[PDB]
Design a protein around this ligand. Structure first.
Ligand SMILES: *[C@@H]1O[C@H](CO[C@H]2O[C@@H](C)[C@@H](O)[C@@H](O)[C@@H]2O)[C@@H](O[C@@H]2O[C@H](CO)[C@@H](O[C@@H]3O[C@H](CO[C@H]4O[C@H](CO)[C@@H](O)[C@H](O)[C@@H]4O[C@@H]4O[C@H](CO)[C@@H](O[C@@H]5O[C@H](CO)[C@H](O)[C@H](O)[C@H]5O)[C@H](O)[C@H]4NC(C)=O)[C@@H](O)[C@H](O[C@H]4O[C@H](CO)[C@@H](O)[C@H](O)[C@@H]4O[C@@H]4O[C@H](CO)[C@@H](O)[C@H](O)[C@H]4NC(C)=O)[C@@H]3O)[C@H](O)[C@H]2NC(C)=O)[C@H](O)[C@H]1NC(C)=O
Lengths: 208, 176
């Protein structure tokens, strides 16, 4: 019969209040013989009714995919509320339930440090700026780079790694054209994490 | 049966002994049968094949059925950069040194911190991460007492990789 996957919001969406975090319950392998699907949603076991369910969409393998999207409150997600999606379909012997929530554990604040390039690399046409993010918990985080209020997306970020004290660390580095750096343009590392004051901090660097 | 490669430093340093390890035995180098596999007795089992550094590095295939070999692809030399602590972090009694290693292929590498001939405690090194151009990158972070940093002690990031000259480079830093 059908199967169910339940997807959490992305951390940046739960962390910036102007953004729109959603939980998404997806049902696949819905047959033609029994195409009707019903969703019941619960937040800490209490039924909610504000989900937006899309009509069924036939896939190229001749089964339907049915999607329901629950809008969450940012504070609810961050306070560890459990979101349950129950899926009924007449081909099932019983409804399928799936539950998700934010990673448990005592939040710890990242400290963020930016590191300017080496001289060695400055004899190439690109250069590396490093953002060192340390001491955070849980691992959920967003790290992004920007310049002049706009994204600088030519970066890589290490996945979070466990230190010996139980908290996480990572590095992000941004590859910029060397002329841009020499010209004195300011680059900024933006870190979004539930344990930061206002869930956001930015650290900036430029040449001297 | 699950077959394991040698570790990076073992293939790159000629004084070390690289081994392929077949855990749970026949053994083959590029199809041909070999008979130097020291097996050791089952424990409520593992077989070890000592390999030649150059055979591993030339891409020979080791068969135990699972086969293993070095990752295929043109080797690319790592670039190594070191960063002193942020002046912001200097307000704490621990500070961080960063060694940034980028543009290498294959992923097999050893990136280690040392001072005065000896390994440094309290470091963390990421497993290598795939970049857009097909190469790999990683960072290694050493945490030291501000005391040692400010006193002018010299810290070194040693990197061992097949595409380096002598399979080795060392980049050091200290206060100004
Ligand atoms: C018929 O066709 C069906 C549809 O497929 C089309 O695909 C083509 C390639 C082609 O084949 C077409 O013909 C075909 O029609 C097909 O359906 C598929 O069924 C699979 C199961 O058989 C499903 O596999 C699962 O996928 C999960 C990951 O899925 C995401 O990733 C894929 C890969 O890119 C993507 O295609 C999916 O759509 C899905 O995308 C996510 O979508 C959500 C929601 O929209 C996004 O989240 C939202 O994003 C918005 C902004 O857009 C906003 O940010 C919201 O807030 C946010 O919620 C995600 O961003 C997006 N993610 C991406 C892109 O990465 C796997 O996780 C899952 O793995 C689990 O289950 C396995 C068993 O099935 C198990 O072995 C595995 O270990 C794992 O187990 C889980 O472990 C977790 C933690 O470790 C636990 O949390 C779980 O409890 C645990 N689960 C267990 C044990 O069960 C799984 O592999 C596939 O998704 C589905 N495809 C689609 C499109 O729905 C069908 O199978 C076909 N049938 C036949 C018979 O062929």
């Amino acid at each position: 019969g059908p199967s169910v996957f339940l997807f959490p919001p992305k951390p940046k969406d739960t962390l910036m209040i102007s953004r729109t975090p959603e939980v998404t319950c997806v049902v696949v392998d819905v047959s033609h013989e029994d195409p009707e699907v019903k969703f019941n949603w619960y937040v800490d076991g209490v039924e909610v009714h504000n989900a937006k369910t899309k009509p069924r969409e036939e896939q190229y393998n001749s089964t339907y995919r049915v999607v329901s999207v629950l809008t969450v409150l940012h504070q609810d997600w961050l306070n560890g509320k459990e979101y349950k999606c129950k899926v009924s379909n007449k081909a099932l012997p019983a409804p399928i339930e799936k539950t998700i929530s934010k990673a448990k554990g005592q939040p710890r604040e990242p400290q963020v440090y930016t590191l300017p390039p080496s001289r060695e690399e400055m004899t190439k046409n690109q250069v590396k700026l490093v953002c060192l993010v340390t001491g955070f918990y849980p691992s959920d985080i967003a790290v992004e780079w920007e310049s002049s209020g706009q994204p600088e997306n030519n970066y890589y970020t290490t996945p979070p790694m466990l230190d010996s004290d139980g908290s996480f660390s990572l590095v992000s580095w941004l590859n910029v054209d060397k002329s841009r750096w020499q010209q004195g343009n300011i680059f900024s590392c933006s870190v979004m994490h539930e344990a930061l004051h206002n869930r956001f901090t930015q650290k900036s660097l430029s040449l001297s």
